[PDB]
Design a binder for this molecule. Sequence first.
Ligand SMILES: N[C@@H](CCC(=O)N[C@@H](CS)C(=O)NCC(=O)O)C(=O)O
Lengths: 281, 281
Amino acid sequence: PPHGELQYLGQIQHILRCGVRKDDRTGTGTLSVFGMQARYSLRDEFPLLTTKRVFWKGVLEELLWFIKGSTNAKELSSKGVKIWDANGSRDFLDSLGFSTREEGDLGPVYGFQWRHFGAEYRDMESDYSGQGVDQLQKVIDTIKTNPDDRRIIMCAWNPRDLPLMALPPCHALCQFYVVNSELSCQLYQRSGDMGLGVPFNIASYALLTYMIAHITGLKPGDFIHTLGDAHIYLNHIEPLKIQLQREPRPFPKLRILRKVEKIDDFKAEDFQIEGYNPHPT
Amino acid sequence: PPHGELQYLGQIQHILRCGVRKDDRTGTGTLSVFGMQARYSLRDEFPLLTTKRVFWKGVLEELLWFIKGSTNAKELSSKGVKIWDANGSRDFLDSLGFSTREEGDLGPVYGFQWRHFGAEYRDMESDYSGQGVDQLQKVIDTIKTNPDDRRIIMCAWNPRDLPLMALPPCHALCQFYVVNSELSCQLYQRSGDMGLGVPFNIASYALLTYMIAHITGLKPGDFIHTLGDAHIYLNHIEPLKIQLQREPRPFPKLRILRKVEKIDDFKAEDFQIEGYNPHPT
Ligand SMILES: N[C@@H](CCC(=O)N[C@@H](CS)C(=O)NCC(=O)O)C(=O)O
């Protein structure tokens, strides 16, 4: 039973040993490898990385935010998670040309593409009922009616909506697989920072997978995490090596409390992470 | 230095070792796995599988057909290739509620998504100029003006059009990467028939890289093939055991003899494969 988090570190161990310098948008350098993959068992465990703390409240409150279909940052900020706010800020908007938008309007980001892929996006307050493809609900329905399906895919990459978004999607598309009553989910991340984001992402889709599994009566199977530009900031190479020598502690467990039957019904108070003991720093 | 095809074979084996039983949309039953990723170097060699020749006339002629934006199966038919005409016969079209459609009208498939993502669809023979998002050119433009971009993506998976298609895209999305003046490409393939498809698209996208490289002046790097539901059809199990023994012969080499600018200008005669000595047919 080799710890799952070992697959993760292995990727860093690998980016170091084999990666090369590639500068990002702001000119800042990174060491990176293009195209990677990792698999995580969702069976009785829950891949909430222990070799460093993962902002789980952010993972959970944001996912719940994505499900509502919200695109208004303040609506997220409200619950304590302040990570999108910087994109829905006044100045940031006026700068991308969205001077006409009210503060908080991120555009057709994850939420929108998730529940209304295709609908003409108007404001962060337009009513979108019945408009655009509701991928989330559709993935769910498919899993129930036709679990063998090889097309249970949710996709946030809307070439059309791109120039209207606060920033491109990172988790472009995810695929759901069902076999032997187990539900798996692969996620394609175009770009991920192995150090800060990825651990969060691994958590998000693991959470999401636990959810749909619950709603449909399946046992969480595996979580395949696939990347495009997996990278690390050169200015972090040290903080990271000090981490690779760290030994992974057994992955906590996610336990859903009440029996939720609809995905929109899930509330924060329904999840409990137990046994999460990560290495401080 | 390990030989390239070892990848694809090693996957055939693993799908045999662990490939769990799972049926398709015809109950044909298969040995399936979910979440795989192979890496193929495109440096000086071309990955055209040798333990079983690959219909190159198709790989090349179809990709060209894609680039054209042609959603007519006869168009790819006239060129001496018939693999997308079955889906355009007649009983088939009506078989999906598509009666009003001409003979050979495939719907918003690949080509249309590559050159007109988002453009309201009509019929195989109508003009979509200045319509949609011309991802393909947009990708190349970007490869040239910003090789660092972590969002160089072409997506054929459109939830809105998915209903008007014959078969939904197996080539969900692909991502291009540049570094050290090298162009790499990762393709996300949702489902894949290991013994009759996988080889065909590996090359198909490898070819695509080589083309874009030639017009962007970058040199081919590696093609990353990521799979979702990677399967082996039950019957295919025996032939694959004997094809699985055939020892791999050196990858051929693709030579773009002529020299072109735009991508809408390549032609079947502009390519050559040498060193391609396939195993007995
Ligand atoms: N937007 C950057 C990439 C930024 C990136 O990968 N950020 C990580 C955080 S360090 C992320 O977006 N994570 C999103 C999530 O975990 O949901 C680019 O493509 O140039």
